[PDB]
Write a protein that binds this ligand. Structure first.
Ligand code: CLA
Ligand code: CLA
Ligand code: CLA
Ligand code: CLA
Ligand code: CLA
Ligand code: CLA
Ligand code: CLA
Ligand code: KC2
Ligand code: KC2
Ligand SMILES: CC1=C(C#C/C(C)=C/C=C/C(C)=C/C=C/C=C(C)/C=C/C=C(\C)C#CC2=C(C)C[C@@H](O)CC2(C)C)C(C)(C)C[C@H](O)C1
Ligand SMILES: CC1=CCCC(C)(C)[C@H]1/C=C/C(C)=C/C=C/C(C)=C/C=C/C=C(C)/C=C/C=C(C)/C=C/C1=C(C)CCCC1(C)C
Lengths: 65, 95, 45, 189, 180, 35, 160
């Protein structure tokens, strides 16, 4: 295996292979953020679908000017 | 009058000969007496224990340390890897 | 017109670059054994 | 030095300059910034005398040139004459012969540096002044020469500078003495 | 244990009292990764270059040589007015002083190879560095003047670039930045 | 036009200086029979 | 850094100047400022009361600083700088000789024409007087000038 300056520079970034946090780690935080992301995606989808009308918003070409 | 017959060039030649003779005559006079007088030494009104005064004059540390390239890499690491974010650091292996 | 130098700024590269390299060469030059060799070429390097 | 201390005669406050000893003529001990320490005193003495001997002739000349002019030359204020003679080439003749004498002199300075001749002695005593019969007089004369020289160099300097401000010749300034132009008349504010 | 200059930080290891002008201010620690002799030679050389330069900016404004184009009061403007060839002749003369002064050993590795405590290019015409105590205190002065001059020249150059006025003149007839 | 000229002058001067000082660096010693 | 030997030592160095600068220099300086200030104060007061014979016409009524701006044009000030500078170069030699080991005590130029300090004891009393008058003079001169800046008035005139 060749040793290089860039290889030694970036070696600690590729050093902790397989290192894991115990048990469920930060899974509830990930689930909460995923739930928020799902709600955000639903909001933006229903705005484009026109099933949701935010005030001051006009999903239309005529809104360009 | 032009060139080697111009009086201005004669004056310049005399000045140049004076400059050329300045080194032997006055260098020899300095060699005979070259401020080698026991009373001849500099004086400063500042106290010798003032901050910033070195312990020994004309210090030459050995510097058995890193090379110049490592220093340049350190100066570059100032701008691509400063110690700013290592202060905030978070606190097994899967089989 | 002397080197095609119509703008004085053209003389900053024509001098600084040869000097800087020479400075790199001066370190090579100071490292060499510079006593005279009675030979066709100097093998000391 | 009101507090008692060993010190130089001319200036009470300063110590006698080192390597400055009574032996050279006209030593009152004044070398406040040592120059003697930086360069050899004998080489410096040769200079004081050369400048002085040049100066003593120049003080006489600036005064004589005012009163009289050789007939062939025109009478002009002396500083003007140098310009006239330089165009004439008279000054080159003075420069050439003075340089030739100086080249012999420059060899003698080298001997002065390497022991050999005492500073400023060209052995020019054609007349019998300070002759072996008069040899006693030489020490005294030496003092006069440095003193006249020190004074002449100050005097010429003075005549030329005073002359430039006054625009008035030195003999004339003596007999008619006026303030630098405009001072009695001018009000700064 | 603690730098004098920066009490919070630690004394840079390399800095001990021996070099002059050492109040411990090497916060970024260049000292650890370069030769102090190289660094000092630069602290001195930039200052000596900007002791001549700072005096230069002030003198040029008050008095200018008789030759043509040496007449621009502003230093920055003058660089362009003066004949270009003359500026190169100065460059080269200075360049020779470099090689002769350093004896041709002109690089980080070799300059200090023989003696040459940093900055001892030998110019002590009036011996004033004979007393040691005197030398130790004069050396602080040079560094303190070198360090001030560096800051001063930068200020004068930048302030002239905005004002198109020499340092003394700008202080007279000072105008706020918006006017320029 | 001036900027292209100054870039070309910089590049040519750099390469010519490298050539000149490289052949000044005891090029004859860079042979396999050198001891 | 402050010890009893210097005359005038009441022990007052709050900012510790003595620690960084040779006392011999500091003293030579205090006397030199004092000797100048005493003369300056005297002059500013004298100038209001009397003027030399032709002076009023050339300079008119300008006083204090204003006179200086007018005086420089006369060149009276220059002669003063050139001559005072010539004395000062000897003074630089004197400080240098003193800083180099030398006999002269700070502030001694050897001017005692009337032989007033011939008694050793009387000299000490006079030395204290000289620092004290000088310290006062400097305070006064600064005051007269500042008073001038603000009131545009000469000090005797301000009293008038
Ligand atoms: C791909 C190259 C690379 C790599 C490996 C790093 C690596 C690092 N950088 Mg980054 N950085 C880079 C490029 C890179 N940087 C570039 C190109 C820039 C912009 C010019 C930055 C700007 C940057 C900042 C502003 C900071 C870091 C910091 C850090 C360090 C974070 C860890 C810590 O706090 O200790 C780490 C060593 C942080 C630090 O604290 O460094 C010690 C920090 O404050 N870097
Ligand atoms: C002794 C050698 C010698 C000779 C040949 C010359 C020749 C000359 N000098 Mg003189 N000069 C000399 C020495 C000499 N100089 C010295 C030692 C000094 C003092 C440093 C000067 C100072 C001097 C000045 C200040 C000027 C000249 C000028 C001149 C030129 C004009 C001639 C002239 O006036 O018309 C002919 C001369 C006369 C009519 C005058 C009468 C001369 C008589 C008849 C001759 C006497 C003998 C003669 C002096 C030769 C002496 C040496 C001999 C005994 C072996 C001429 C080239 C002038 C010049 O440059 O031209 C404008 C000028 O202004 N010279
Ligand atoms: C011997 C040395 C010396 C000499 C030659 C001068 C020469 C001069 N001084 Mg200076 N001066 C000197 C020493 C000297 N001073 C000293 C030691 C001091 C005290 C530190 C001064 C302080 C001084 C001042 C304050 C002034 C001068 C002025 C003058 C000028 C006089 C006015 C004029 O034009 O002449 C005409 C002279 C007279 C009518 C009087 C002459 C009286 C007798 C004959 C002498 C003149 C250039 C004045 C000046 O600048 O004028 C432009 C001026 O205001 N001088
Ligand atoms: C023929 C011309 C010539 C030659 C051969 C030399 C030779 C030398 N000079 Mg130079 N010099 C010359 C002319 C010359 N001088 C002239 C005319 C001047 C102006 C008066 C200088 C000013 C000068 C200074 C100020 C210094 C030298 C130094 C040196 C020595 C090291 C050279 C080296 O490695 O630099 C090779 C070139 C470089 C390394 C490039 C320069 C580095 C850049 C400019 C630094 C930029 C820093 C940056 C702006 C700050 C960061 C800001 C932040 C916000 C990021 C060497 C003996 C140095 C020395 O002795 O060091 C101990 C030194 O400090 N010289
Ligand atoms: C020796 C230092 C020094 C001094 C005395 C001055 C003087 C001055 N500068 Mg310059 N300056 C300097 C060097 C210096 N400068 C340096 C090192 C730089 C960076 C290269 C500049 C950057 C600079 C710029 C860019 C210019 C100023 C300007 C000014 C003026 C406004 C200063 C002000 O209000 O500050 C405000 C500071 C305070 C009120 C508090 C300061 C408290 C402590 C003591 C610091 C002032 C006359 C301006 C000028 O010249 O004309 C507009 C201007 O544009 N200064
Ligand atoms: C400039 C005038 C001056 C100078 C050089 C001195 C110097 C000295 N005094 Mg004196 N003193 C002065 C004015 C001065 N004094 C005045 C006006 C008073 C009356 C309030 C006194 C009252 C006094 C007493 C009662 C005593 C001294 C003592 C001393 C000695 C030790 C004090 C010390 O270390 O601080 C040195 C003093 C200074 C550095 C002055 C600092 C003034 C300000 C704060 C400086 C600010 C910076 C400045 C404005 C920058 C511009 C400078 C520029 C013009 C070059 C020292 C010889 C003591 C003594 O005899 O010890 C032997 C002692 O007991 N002094
Ligand atoms: C710090 C000291 C100082 C300074 C800077 C000045 C500066 C000035 N004075 Mg003032 N003056 C001083 C001290 C000083 N004076 C003293 C001590 C006296 C009392 C004799 C005077 C009496 C005085 C008068 C009457 C006049 C001036 C005038 C002037 C102006 C022109 C110079 C001149 O001709 O004065 C000449 C001054 C003197 C000849 C006094 C010199 C006395 C010295 C200090 C004696 C030193 C002691 C000595 C060793 C013993 C002998 C100028 C603004 C003139 C002016 O423009 O005002 C309208 C003017 O008419 N001055
Ligand atoms: C201290 C650095 C320095 C040194 C060591 C040095 C030595 C010599 C020597 C060798 C002994 C000669 C023979 C020589 C000759 C000339 N120098 Mg000089 N010279 C130096 C500095 C400057 C500057 C700053 C200028 C200058 C000039 C000229 C001109 C005018 C050309 C013309 O007539 O137009 C001529 C002939 C000016 C210039 O070149 O302007 C175009 C000008 O600005 N030099 N110079
Ligand atoms: C040594 C004592 C002394 C000093 C220190 C001194 C200083 C100055 C200064 C310094 C700042 C200026 C600028 C100045 C100016 C004039 N002085 Mg004066 N002067 C002094 C003494 C005398 C005497 C004895 C006379 C005199 C005169 C004039 C005239 C004449 C023309 C005029 O009145 O317009 C003018 C311009 C003569 C005169 O005519 O006085 C009415 C005259 O006899 N001064 N004087
Ligand atoms: C030492 C000693 C002895 C001796 C001796 C002697 C007798 C020495 C005498 C020395 C003297 C008199 C020196 C005079 C200096 C005068 C000066 C420098 C004036 C400068 C004027 C200036 C700066 C100005 C100005 C300006 C002003 C005011 C305003 C402007 O608008 C105009 C202007 C430009 C004019 C001797 C040889 C006997 C023996 C001994 O072995 C040792
Ligand atoms: C100009 C241009 C035209 C003319 C000719 C040209 C060649 C074309 C060219 C010339 C160019 C060159 C000469 C221009 C380049 C010029 C100058 C010499 C650069 C000066 C920079 C000063 C810096 C900003 C300093 C800040 C000082 C710090 C804050 C002090 C910090 C301090 C330390 C850290 C801590 C303690 C206290 C404090 C005070 C806090």
């Amino acid at each position: 295996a060749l040793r290089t300056r860039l290889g030694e520079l970036l070696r600690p970034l590729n050093s902790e292979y397989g290192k894991v946090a115990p048990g469920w780690g930060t899974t509830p935080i990930m689930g909460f953020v995923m739930l928020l992301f799902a709600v955000f995606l639903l909001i933006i989808l229903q705005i484009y679908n026109s099933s949701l009308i935010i005030e001051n918003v006009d999903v239309d070409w005529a809104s360009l000017g | 009058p032009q060139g080697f017959t111009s009086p201005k060039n004669h004056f310049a030649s005399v000045i140049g000969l004076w400059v050329l003779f300045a080194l032997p005559v006055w260098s020899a006079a300095y060699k005979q007496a070259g401020c080698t007088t026991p009373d001849w030494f500099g004086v400063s009104q500042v106290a010798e224990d003032a901050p910033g005064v070195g312990l020994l004059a004309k210090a030459a540390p050995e510097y058995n340390g890193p090379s110049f390239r490592e220093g340049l890499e350190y100066v570059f690491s100032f701008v691509w890897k400063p110690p700013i974010l290592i202060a905030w650091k978070p606190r097994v292996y899967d089989e | 017109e002397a080197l095609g130098v119509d703008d004085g700024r053209l003389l900053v590269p024509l001098v600084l670059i040869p000097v800087f390299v020479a400075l790199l060469y001066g370190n090579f030059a100071s490292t060499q054994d510079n006593e005279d060799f009675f030979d066709t070429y100097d093998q000391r390097r | 030095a009101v507090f008692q201390g060993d010190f130089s005669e001319s200036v009470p406050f300063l110590k006698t300059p080192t390597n400055l000893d009574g032996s050279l003529p006209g030593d009152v001990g004044f070398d406040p910034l040592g120059f003697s320490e930086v360069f050899d005193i004998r080489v410096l003495r040769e200079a004081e005398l050369k400048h002085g001997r040049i100066a003593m002739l120049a003080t006489l000349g600036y005064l004589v040139q005012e009163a009289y002019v050789f007939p062939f030359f025109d009478k002009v204020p002396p500083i003007q004459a140098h310009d006239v003679l330089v165009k004439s080439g008279g000054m080159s003749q003075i420069l050439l012969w003075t340089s030739f004498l100086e080249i012999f002199g420059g060899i003698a300075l080298f001997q002065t540096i390497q022991g050999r001749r005492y500073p400023g002695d060209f052995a020019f005593d054609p007349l019998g002044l300070s002759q072996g019969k008069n040899a006693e007089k030489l020490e005294r004369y030496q003092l006069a020469e440095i003193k006249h020289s020190r004074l002449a160099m100050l005097a010429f300097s003075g005549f030329v500078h005073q002359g430039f401000i006054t625009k008035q010749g030195v003999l004339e300034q003596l007999g008619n003495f006026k303030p630098i132009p405009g001072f009695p008349e001018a009000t700064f504010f | 244990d603690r730098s004098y200059s920066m009490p919070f930080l630690e004394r840079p290891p390399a800095l001990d009292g021996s070099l002059a002008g050492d109040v411990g201010f090497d916060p970024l620690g260049f000292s650890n990764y370069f030769d102090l002799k190289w660094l000092r030679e630069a602290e001195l050389k930039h200052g000596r270059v900007c002791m001549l330069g700072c005096t230069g900016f002030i003198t040029q404004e008050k008095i200018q040589l008789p030759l043509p184009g040496f007449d621009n009061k502003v230093a920055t403007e003058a660089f362009f007015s003066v004949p270009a060839g003359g500026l190169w002749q100065i460059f080269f003369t200075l360049g020779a002083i470099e090689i002769l002064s350093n004896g041709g050993k002109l690089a980080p590795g070799d300059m200090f190879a023989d003696g040459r405590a940093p900055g001892d290019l030998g110019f002590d015409p009036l011996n004033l560095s004979g007393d040691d105590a005197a030398l130790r205190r004069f050396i602080l002065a040079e560094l303190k003047h070198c360090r001030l001059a560096m800051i001063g020249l930068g200020g004068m150059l930048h302030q002239m670039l905005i004002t198109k006025q020499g340092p003394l003149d700008q202080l007279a007839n000072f105008q706020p930045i918006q006017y320029y | 036009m001036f900027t292209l000229k100054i870039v070309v002058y910089t590049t040519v001067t750099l390469f010519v200086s490298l050539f000149t000082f490289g052949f000044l660096s005891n090029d004859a010693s860079r042979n396999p029979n050198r001891k | 850094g402050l010890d009893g030997t210097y005359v005038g030592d009441v022990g007052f160095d709050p900012l510790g100047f003595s620690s960084i600068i040779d006392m011999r220099w500091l003293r030579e300086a205090e006397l030199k400022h004092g000797r100048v200030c005493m003369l300056a104060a005297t002059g500013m007061i004298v100038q209001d009361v009397y003027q030399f014979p032709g002076v009023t016409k050339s300079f008119g009524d300008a006083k204090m600083t204003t006179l200086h701006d007018v005086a420089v044009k006369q060149g009276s000030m220059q002669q003063l700088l050139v001559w005072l500078g010539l004395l000062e170069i000897f003074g630089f030699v004197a400080i240098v000789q003193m800083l180099q080991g030398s006999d002269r005590q700070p502030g001694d130029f050897g001017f005692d024409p009337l032989n007033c300090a011939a008694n050793p004891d009387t000299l000490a009393r006079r030395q204290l007087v000289e620092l004290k008058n000088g310290r006062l003079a400097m305070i006064a001169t600064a005051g007269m000038l500042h008073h001038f800046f603000i009131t545009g008035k000469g000090p005797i005139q301000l009293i008038t």
